[PDB]
Enzyme design. Structure first.
Site, PDB file in Angstrom:
ATOM      1  CD  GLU A 149      16.403 -67.605  55.490  1.00  0.00           C
ATOM      2  OE1 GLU A 149      16.392 -67.348  54.296  1.00  0.00           O
ATOM      3  OE2 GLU A 149      17.493 -68.644  55.915  1.00  0.00           O
ATOM      4  CB  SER A 191      18.412 -69.445  47.991  1.00  0.00           C
ATOM      5  OG  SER A 191      17.072 -69.097  47.720  1.00  0.00           O
ATOM      6  CG  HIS A 239      16.998 -65.628  51.408  1.00  0.00           C
ATOM      7  ND1 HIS A 239      17.071 -66.652  52.237  1.00  0.00           N
ATOM      8  CD2 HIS A 239      17.086 -65.822  50.187  1.00  0.00           C
ATOM      9  CE1 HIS A 239      17.136 -67.767  51.235  1.00  0.00           C
ATOM     10  NE2 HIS A 239      17.151 -67.148  49.863  1.00  0.00           N
TER      11      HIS A 239
HETATM   12  C1  LIG Z   1      11.013 -62.322  39.649  1.00  0.00           C
HETATM   13  N1  LIG Z   1      10.642 -61.148  40.262  1.00  0.00           N
HETATM   14  C2  LIG Z   1      11.786 -60.175  40.436  1.00  0.00           C
HETATM   15  C3  LIG Z   1       9.736 -60.424  39.588  1.00  0.00           C
HETATM   16  C4  LIG Z   1      10.171 -61.445  41.646  1.00  0.00           C
HETATM   17  C5  LIG Z   1      11.111 -62.608  42.421  1.00  0.00           C
HETATM   18  O1  LIG Z   1      12.101 -61.864  43.084  1.00  0.00           O
HETATM   19  C6  LIG Z   1      12.699 -62.376  44.221  1.00  0.00           C
HETATM   20  O2  LIG Z   1      12.871 -63.420  44.374  1.00  0.00           O
HETATM   21  C7  LIG Z   1      13.226 -61.418  45.174  1.00  0.00           C
HETATM   22  C8  LIG Z   1      14.675 -61.940  45.652  1.00  0.00           C
HETATM   23  C9  LIG Z   1      15.582 -61.423  44.881  1.00  0.00           C
HETATM   24  O3  LIG Z   1      15.336 -60.974  43.606  1.00  0.00           O
HETATM   25  O4  LIG Z   1      17.008 -61.410  44.969  1.00  0.00           O
HETATM   26  C10 LIG Z   1      17.607 -62.647  45.265  1.00  0.00           C
HETATM   27  C11 LIG Z   1      18.814 -62.296  46.035  1.00  0.00           C
HETATM   28  N2  LIG Z   1      19.453 -63.633  46.663  1.00  0.00           N
HETATM   29  C12 LIG Z   1      20.102 -64.563  45.512  1.00  0.00           C
HETATM   30  C13 LIG Z   1      20.304 -63.511  47.480  1.00  0.00           C
HETATM   31  C14 LIG Z   1      18.315 -64.497  47.127  1.00  0.00           C
END
Ligand SMILES: C[N+](C)(C)CCOC(=O)CCC(=O)OCC[N+](C)(C)C
Ligand SMILES: *[C@@H]1O[C@H](CO)[C@@H](O[C@@H]2O[C@H](CO)[C@@H](O)[C@H](O)[C@H]2NC(C)=O)[C@H](O)[C@H]1NC(C)=O
Ligand SMILES: C[N+](C)(C)CCOC(=O)CCC(=O)OCC[N+](C)(C)C
Ligand SMILES: *[C@@H]1O[C@H](CO)[C@@H](O)[C@H](O)[C@H]1NC(C)=O
Ligand SMILES: *[C@@H]1O[C@H](CO)[C@@H](O)[C@H](O)[C@H]1NC(C)=O
Ligand SMILES: C[C@@H]1O[C@@H](O)[C@@H](O)[C@H](O)[C@@H]1O
EC number: 3.1.1.7
Lengths: 534, 536
Positions: B328, B203, B441
């Site tokens: 994804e 990512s 993802h």
């Molecule tokens: C900032 N917010 C939480 C208000 C919205 C954004 O959240 C995400 O990106 C969703 C993806 C996520 O939070 O986890 C990422 C897990 N990973 C690292 C495997 C992608």
């Protein structure tokens, strides 16, 4: 004097000729006049009904072909010459033909009325592929076909003028339809069971009769083969018809409409045809100079508007397409293409061909077509590009317009049956790359493979016999399936949900779903949104 | 010293370290965890480039993971492994610029290829200390030297007043670079070969790897790269100088801070948490897969846009491994698209699909959005809520990951790089997200790092074998620039990605299958059509 060959119609007496069909004789009445000859002052004017005649009129022979352009791209070649006029050309051409069983039907028989295609600039009911004897003999049908005016003579229009109102070739067809209501009983035909069928511009014509109220009392069912009233080529607006008529006038030294039309009427027929292909706005293919006009009379609104707002409840329609609708048209304008080679083209030639094949498209819309039809795994492969060019032209001009009509009619009460025709005639003289080209289903529906002198295979004769049954079952009942039967692959109606249609080929019926659904969404939903915003 | 394991005492440039002997399933490994690589970027140092760590006296204890960089902590689903597995597992602090090293025990006799992990999390989250990034299995089974660094995220890593001295932007990437420099100077003390370093991340971590490829000063610090489910090109990984400035300025206002020096000075007086509490309030649209503070095209770290740089670059010396998971987009739909939830099947309506596309493609005009809806509709079943859900997932995934990757792979291949591409299609048997989300993802990472080898984790036997295959592909690539084994000819071969043939392999429980064209038609839509629509 054979009494089966002597018929009295409203205008007088006719004598027909007994013809030989493979399985028995048929009665044919050919060259029956249905209108006053549209000559001199009557050029560009609506047809008038034929004055009654004395004695016994000889109806044993085909009459003249309406004055038209004759193809010379490939002199002597059967593939082109099978569509060229086979009788002398004349403006005196408003005659129709009737085939009936011999002896004439005991009880009233369903009538099929064939309207030929040819871009609204050509065609004739005398062409051998339109021979009604096989359907007459085998299916007991009464088959009718009419000449209608084509080119400037049928479709030159100065909209709003009294003397060149437009659509007069469609009014020719309508008068023949009126003639059938009044006279067809005399031949054993049932005027309460008439089915229009036609191909290409003839299918567009049929659709225009569906969409014009006066025509609707003159038939009960319709078949549109490879053609639609909606779409890019079948109609022009009043402004564009006027523009072309005015430019043609200028090209032939003519000259207030009255004055302009008057001068055009003084011109030899061939002087008009000479300048017919100089009035189109772009370098194009699948585009025809003089075609039906949205006049606000015959066509009360555009075919699009009419198909979207129409009520089609007590209507049955059979519609379909051939496998390779676009291929034929490529040899008539797109650089790189020819019947005499495999037409393996460059990507450059593909981009150029799209501008000719989608002549009204903007730079961006042309680019969207190229990107949609490119195989990004084989983006420069000449076979893919050649076949893609065929697809663009066929989809834009026929398949996607058909899909759109099928769905509006179905959504709005009509009972619709759809097909794709996939058999390539063994006798075809066009190269293999063109596949199953535009027009090459007609000979099977008319039953020509039943004539053993024509060198079709045994499978094609059996296939033709199947198609003749579907078409005549449809004529009889508005359903191409057998009422009592063989059975268990039934042809289902086309609906907007399931989008079922059938493959017509040497194998038994196969039901498929979605007539090029993703690609026609591109043409019917996306591209309209594109150029109406941009 | 005296009474202490002699295999765990190592000296680096800053001084002496003491590591820890950890148990991997197959035997012990050495870990040196929490090694400071920079001066703590606190106080006056906030927003500024990192300063290398000044030497210490005595023996620094490198036996435990150090603090996590200050960040937003996911609250959507409290107590749920699906989300908690990515959440910080140490305390949050701005004092966080530490790196971790794992090596065989005893340390290798001859110099070993080094793998450097750069974690993901949107450039707003992440830590080198999460279980999923545990280097012990690669070290034990493959004999690898694995490094992972913390880098600053959110405002702290990426808030920028471009052209300023006090907040130049990209400092979290500068943190990553300092770690890469640290490895160069110091990794030989651990038996690592500084002349064979292969980066890898997922990512934002992968976007980060790509930015190091694209940034000159980083190129001397590594030799091969692996970009998983992310790219430097694409819609979310960078912002223009103007957009960075606008976001920084809006944030400043939101925390009560008005000249850039004065603005930045006032930002440095604010509690770290205040910054975190407002960082989501600065995005231009309602959106998903968009992050407030991310790399900026500054004309310094990035001398032009990633798109321009990948189109004009000479990559003859570059061997790269790139790829994607099967689904994804699915993960992101539950964080913003109405209709979606992890706790039901998320069968949406067509109205919800159109709404979601505005959120999933936030920068799209009305015409572009309708092009997307029309392309992704199944015109045989345009109202079917199962296809609509899965098209919504596909839109988000294709736009933000799959088509940027396809893009990157093609430009790199066209311009001399030796490229290898995959799609990962195994859904972990232990996944707690619902089935409809597929192979989401981030859920390949645990296989590459070898977690299934730990019997305490309850993976299947088949999954253990599969993990061992992936660890071999990755380490073979690291070692040789080719993920295939030279001696093993019987196994099917992974061919390089080329523009001519466009080949890539499926990664799943079955032997490698070569496929052609990574979503070729749809990515032509995103990469060729929409851009041409945009110019008009
Ligand atoms: C900032 N917010 C939480 C208000 C919205 C954004 O959240 C995400 O990106 C969703 C993806 C996520 O939070 O986890 C990422 C897990 N990973 C690292 C495997 C992608
Ligand atoms: C699955 O769960 C979601 C999450 O609550 C439900 O989504 C809501 O749907 C309603 C009705 O259409 C909307 O008013 C809300 O905006 C949605 N909530 C949010 C914020 O996602 C969804 O309805 C559930 N599916 C079913 C039918 O059980
Ligand atoms: C379709 N059909 C089988 C009934 C007849 C074939 O006619 C054509 O030549 C098709 C190409 C064409 O339309 O050309 C018109 C343009 N022109 C006049 C320059 C030849
Ligand atoms: C195919 O034939 C046409 C007609 O002569 C010609 O213009 C075209 O270039 C030919 N293509 C090839 C590559 O043979
Ligand atoms: C794994 O399975 C065991 C054995 O049944 C169970 O007791 C344990 O709590 C599970 N642990 C995990 C990591 O799910
Ligand atoms: C299954 C769904 O889960 C979520 C809630 O917001 C909804 O109301 C529903 O219960």
């Amino acid at each position: 004097e054979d009494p089966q060959l002597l018929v009295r119609v409203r205008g007088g007496q006719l004598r027909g000729i007994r013809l030989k069909a493979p399985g028995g004789p048929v009665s044919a009445f050919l060259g029956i006049p249905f209108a006053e000859p549209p000559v001199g002052s009557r050029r560009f004017m609506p047809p008038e009904p034929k004055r009654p005649w004395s004695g016994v009129l000889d109806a044993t022979t085909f009459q003249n072909v309406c004055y038209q352009y004759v193809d010379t791209l490939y002199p002597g070649f059967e593939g082109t010459e099978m569509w060229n006029p086979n009788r002398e050309l004349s403006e005196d051409c408003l005659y129709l033909n009737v085939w009936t069983p011999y002896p004439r039907p005991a009880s009233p028989t369903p009538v099929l009325i064939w309207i030929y295609g040819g871009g609204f600039y050509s065609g004739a009911a005398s062409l051998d592929v339109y021979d009604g004897r096989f359907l007459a003999q085998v299916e007991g049908a009464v088959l009718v076909s009419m000449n209608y005016r084509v080119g400037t003579f049928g479709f030159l229009a100065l909209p709003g003028s009294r003397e060149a109102p437009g659509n007069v070739g469609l009014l020719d067809q309508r008068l023949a339809l009126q003639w059938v209501q009044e006279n067809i009983a005399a031949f054993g035909g049932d005027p309460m069971s008439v089915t229009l069928f036609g191909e290409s511009a003839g299918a567009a014509s049929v659709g225009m009769h569906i969409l014009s109220l006066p025509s609707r009392s003159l038939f009960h069912r319709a078949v549109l083969q490879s053609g639609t009233p909606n779409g890019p080529w079948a109609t022009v607006s009043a402004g564009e018809a006027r523009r072309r008529a005015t430019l043609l006038a200028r090209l032939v030294g003519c000259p207030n409409d009255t004055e302009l039309i008057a001068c055009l009427r003084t011109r030899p027929a061939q002087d008009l045809v000479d300048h017919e292909w100089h009035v189109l706005p772009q370098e194009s293919i699948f585009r025809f100079s003089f075609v039906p006009v949205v006049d606000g009379d015959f066509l009360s609104d555009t075919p699009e508007a009419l198909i979207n707002t129409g009520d089609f409840q007590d209507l049955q329609v059979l519609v379909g397409v051939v496998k390779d609708e676009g291929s034929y048209f490529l040899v008539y304008g797109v650089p790189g293409f020819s019947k005499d080679n495999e037409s393996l083209i460059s990507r450059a030639q593909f981009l150029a061909g799209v501008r000719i094949g989608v002549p009204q498209a903007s730079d961006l819309a042309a680019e969207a077509v190229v990107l949609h039809y490119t195989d990004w795994l084989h983006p420069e492969d000449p076979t893919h590009l050649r076949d893609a060019m065929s697809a663009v032209v066929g989809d834009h001009n026929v398949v996607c317009p058909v899909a759109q009509l099928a769905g509006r009619l179905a959504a709005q009460g009509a009972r619709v049956y759809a097909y794709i025709f996939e058999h390539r005639a063994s006798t075809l003289t066009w190269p293999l790359w063109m596949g199953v080209p535009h027009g090459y289903e007609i000979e099977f529906i008319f039953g020509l493979p039943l004539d053993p002198s024509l060198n079709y295979t045994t499978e094609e004769r059996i296939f033709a016999q199947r198609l003749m049954k579907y078409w005549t079952n449809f004529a009889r009942t508005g359903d191409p399936n057998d009422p009592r039967d063989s059975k268990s692959p039934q042809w289902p109606p086309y609906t907007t949900a399931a989008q079922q249609y059938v493959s017509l080929n040497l194998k038994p019926l196969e039901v498929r779903r979605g007539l090029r659904a993703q690609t026609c969404a591109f043409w019917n939903r996306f591209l309209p949104k594109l150029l109406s915003a941009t």
